[PDB]
């Protein structure tokens, strides 16, 4: 069981660059592809992400995609830049100009053939794979433009493999581009059918977590990409290391999704403590579970207290005990009996692994499927509402062949999605 990696645009590449810095140190490899580890459990499942090479070297199964050559220049020269194979870097020369229309129809259609030739090469080399990881953002043009195109083309060829996309959805309070609502609405139109499991993150909330819980006075894009990676790495720790009770990517999908369209998730991580307040803290499971369910710690700008949890999960790492995980989970359900659906008994999925993150004793990851997402999509639909009334900025997109009908479907399908979550709330 091994998984290939796809990154798109400036947003994804900056997120994806931190991933290979963190997971590489986890498996003990140097910056030049060499190995110098100690524990044998590192080599047991090294191949879930890497490919072997001559001379005892490893290279990752990553693809970096772009429509401008600037960002590849940064990642190539940066730390851990020589790990990647040169053939994997796929980039154009023109750019997107924050156009969803240019990315899908005009510019990306020429460059789409090149990448599928590469992902086909990585798909044959792997013996028995399960999923693809996609990293992108929903504001710009390249990430939402080609990111939508590959997903449709990837899905058709492989309708039996699981698909993962780790999306970043825009927020009004940190709004940055005049044409954001046009991009975000058009892309989610096809994520409602062409992906299996979807994560949503906000730059607004990642600012809420960074100042208050971390006591960060200078949150740059260095640290935010740090936080998303640790949630990204935690989900697939059952694959790379053993455990008392196991859960791979396929188990979670069946356990959380009651109906095919309700697969928009909310991350959360614990512990997250400041550099000075760590000495004054305990080391126990009950402190972890309270932090996980805290409405003050989620990674989306939506409060769960306006809705009820459908299903949740908890991924624990370290030497722990099975009852204590069991007793904490029942405490929350009984104390918070108002905030959980009634007609699904025992809504919590559990998993414990063995190897803790280096320098720590315990950890936890929360993936909780709630009905509070319906607000995070209505807010966007409102910003899109006042623009399409007067056809502002419409001429830029209409030049590449779209029509007023397509924008009509963009609102209608977004209308359908919010309706479904309200009905089951």
């Amino acid at each position: 069981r091994e998984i290939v990696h796809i990154q798109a645009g400036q947003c994804g590449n900056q997120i994806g660059a931190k991933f290979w810095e963190i997971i590489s140190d986890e498996h003990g490899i140097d910056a030049t592809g060499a190995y110098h580890g100690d524990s044998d459990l590192q080599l047991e499942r090294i191949n879930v992400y890497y490919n072997e090479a001559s001379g005892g070297k490893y290279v990752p199964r990553a693809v970096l995609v772009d429509l401008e050559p600037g960002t590849m220049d940064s990642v190539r020269s940066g730390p851990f830049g020589q790990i990647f194979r040169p053939d994997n870097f796929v980039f154009g020369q023109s750019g997107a100009g924050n156009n969803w229309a240019k990315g899908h129809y005009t510019e990306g259609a020429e460059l789409v053939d090149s990448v599928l030739d590469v992902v086909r090469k990585e798909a044959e080399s792997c013996d028995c794979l399960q999923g693809f990881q996609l990293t992108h953002s929903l504001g710009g043009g390249t990430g939402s433009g080609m990111g939508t195109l590959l997903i449709s083309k990837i899905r058709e060829e492989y309708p039996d493999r699981i698909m993962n996309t780790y999306s970043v959805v825009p927020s009004p309070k940190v709004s940055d581009t005049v044409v954001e609502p046009y991009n975000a609405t058009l892309s989610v139109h096809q994520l409602v059918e062409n992906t299996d499991e979807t994560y949503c993150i906000d730059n607004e909330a990642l600012y809420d977590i960074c100042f208050r819980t971390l006591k960060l006075t200078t949150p740059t894009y260095g640290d935010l990409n740090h936080l998303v990676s640790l949630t990204m790495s935690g989900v697939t720790t059952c694959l790379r290391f053993p455990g008392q009770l196991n859960a791979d990517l396929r188990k979670l999908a069946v356990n959380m999704v009651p109906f095919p369209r309700l697969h928009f998730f909310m991350p959360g991580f614990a512990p997250l403590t400041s550099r000075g307040s760590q000495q004054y803290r305990a080391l126990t499971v009950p402190e972890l579970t309270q932090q996980m369910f805290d409405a003050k710690n989620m990674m989306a700008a939506c409060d769960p207290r306006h809705g009820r949890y459908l299903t949740v999960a908890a991924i624990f790492r370290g030497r722990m005990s099975m009852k204590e995980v069991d007793e904490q989970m029942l405490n929350i359900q009984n104390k918070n009996s108002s905030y959980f659906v009634e007609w699904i008994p025992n809504n919590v999925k559990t998993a414990v692994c063995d190897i803790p993150p280096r320098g720590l004793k315990m950890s936890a990851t929360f993936i909780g499927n709630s009905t509070a997402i319906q607000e995070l999509f209505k807010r966007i639909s409102e910003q899109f509402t006042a623009m399409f009334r007067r056809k502002a900025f419409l001429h830029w997109y209409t030049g590449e062949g779209m029509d007023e009908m397509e924008f009509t479907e963009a609102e209608s399908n977004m209308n359908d999605l919010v309706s479904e979550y309200q009905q089951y709330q």
């Binding site: 069981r1 047991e44 028995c128 399960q130 053993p242 008392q244 009770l245 196991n246 791979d248 396929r250 188990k251 999908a253 069946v254 356990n255 959380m256 009651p258 109906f259 095919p260 299903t311 005990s321 099975m322 009852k323 204590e324 069991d326 007793e327 029942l330 007609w343 699904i344 008994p345 025992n346 809504n347 919590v348 999925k349 559990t350």
Partner: protein, 426 residues
């Protein structure tokens, strides 16, 4: 006189791991299979200084079996006995029974036949599995269906783990634990039910252990199995055989769900202050605070019970201790059972495993009673399954894998009828 044990899934393999460390200590056989008699019941001898078990390890995922392959007990197991897959059933019964079932079910059925060729007096099989996941439920249900046709009248025993009503670990558990009932009902000669949360209370109070993890619970099940088969492996005052045991215990063909309990379990330091004699260990077996499934016998009426003593026991008092119990109106028996005790006294004291959580004793007791108290452990579950099935939640996963929507009707209809039979006899 030989038996074959089959471990299926993570739950079965983990329990089977605990047992085979227990058996080796009993017979003085080192992990590399060499002995520094009676061992033919589970072991096969190869030339000189080599014993290998009559066990087969089964899984659809390599993770929980390759832990054995590298561990301390790599040399004991014959390499062909460890069967692994490539993709797990992902907690789908439908994937276990239908899609991911047949590409592996054939290999083990070929491997069972090889093991059943060496034996001369095959007694029966022991099956270890759980009702939680589809890998241990969907596949194990398929194995028993193929075993029954090929072998027919030979007795098969299982040791199943029932999901708890409150302390449960998954979301879709009720869907699995209802679909296994048909193949257990129609294809099992004796079925043992054990609950996970109940073993926690026994660990908390009697053993005074703060945090029981899955290591210690699996050590407890090893003690129950070892005692039932201790009648074949050794010799004593009275003898009870597996086919003998079914005759006295099971009153009707549809009613084969005994409840198990053990005595004594005690900590090392508190073992000094008490004197453990036959008079009380027969009373400890009947405490509702020591039943291994969260059910109250006070709302049920006993139909039979078997008491297997081992160590230093004399038949002069056992009849007296059994006589004492009969005079209580709290412990109720049915009217059509003028006598309901089957007794077996053995000579070999139970052996304590080093690194364990139990103290060395001179005598031990294992109890196996067929009561109607267990009717509730199914009625509560059927509410959970029916409540979720009202909205057809999660069903889309199972429908696409080969099932149809009326299949869940038979799952509830069968449990509808089976609860009536216990009501009728009660």
């Amino acid at each position: 006189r030989e038996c074959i044990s089959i471990h299926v899934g993570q739950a079965g393999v983990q329990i089977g791991n605990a047992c085979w460390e227990l058996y080796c200590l009993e017979h003085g056989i080192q992990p590399d299979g060499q002995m520094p008699d009676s061992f033919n019941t589970f072991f096969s001898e190869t030339g000189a200084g080599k014993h290998v078990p009559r066990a087969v390890f089964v899984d659809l995922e390599p993770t929980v079996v390759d832990e054995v392959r590298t561990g301390t007990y790599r040399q004991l197991f014959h390499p062909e006995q460890l069967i692994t897959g490539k993709e797990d059933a992902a907690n789908n019964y439908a994937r276990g029974h239908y899609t991911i079932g047949k590409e592996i079910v054939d290999l083990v059925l070929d491997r069972i036949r090889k093991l059943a060729d060496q034996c001369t007096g095959l007694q029966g099989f022991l099956i270890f599995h759980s009702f939680g996941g589809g890998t241990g439920s969907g596949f194990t249900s398929l194995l028993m269906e193929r075993l029954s046709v090929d072998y027919g009248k030979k007795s098969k025993l299982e040791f199943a783990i029932y999901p708890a009503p409150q302390v449960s670990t998954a979301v879709v558990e009720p869907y699995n634990s209802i679909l296994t009932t048909h193949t257990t009902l129609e294809h099992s000669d004796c079925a043992f039910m054990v609950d996970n949360e109940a073993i926690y209370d026994i660990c908390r109070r009697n053993l005074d252990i703060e945090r029981p993890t899955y290591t210690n619970l699996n050590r407890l099940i090893g003690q129950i199995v070892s005692s039932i088969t201790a009648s074949l492996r050794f010799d004593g005052a009275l003898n009870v055989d597996l086919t003998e045991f079914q005759t006295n215990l099971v009153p009707y063909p549809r009613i084969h769900f005994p409840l198990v309990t053990y005595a004594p379990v005690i900590s090392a330091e508190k073992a000094y202050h008490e004197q453990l004699s036959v008079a009380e260990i027969t009373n400890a077996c009947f405490e509702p605070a020591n039943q291994m499934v969260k059910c109250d016998p006070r709302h049920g009426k006993y139909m039979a019970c078997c008491m297997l003593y081992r160590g230093d026991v004399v038949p002069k008092d056992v009849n007296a201790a059994i006589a004492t119990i009969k005079t209580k109106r709290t412990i109720q028996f049915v009217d059509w059972c003028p006598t309901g005790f089957k007794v077996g006294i053995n000579y070999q004291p139970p052996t304590v495993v080093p690194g364990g959580d139990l103290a060395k004793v001179q005598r031990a007791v294992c109890m196996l009673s067929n009561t109607t108290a267990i009717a509730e452990a199914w009625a509560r579950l059927d509410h959970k399954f029916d409540l979720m099935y009202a909205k057809r939640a999660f069903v889309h996963w199972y429908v696409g894998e080969g099932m149809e929507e009326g299949e869940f009707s038979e799952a509830r209809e069968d449990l509808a009828a089976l609860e009536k039979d216990y009501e009728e006899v009660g």
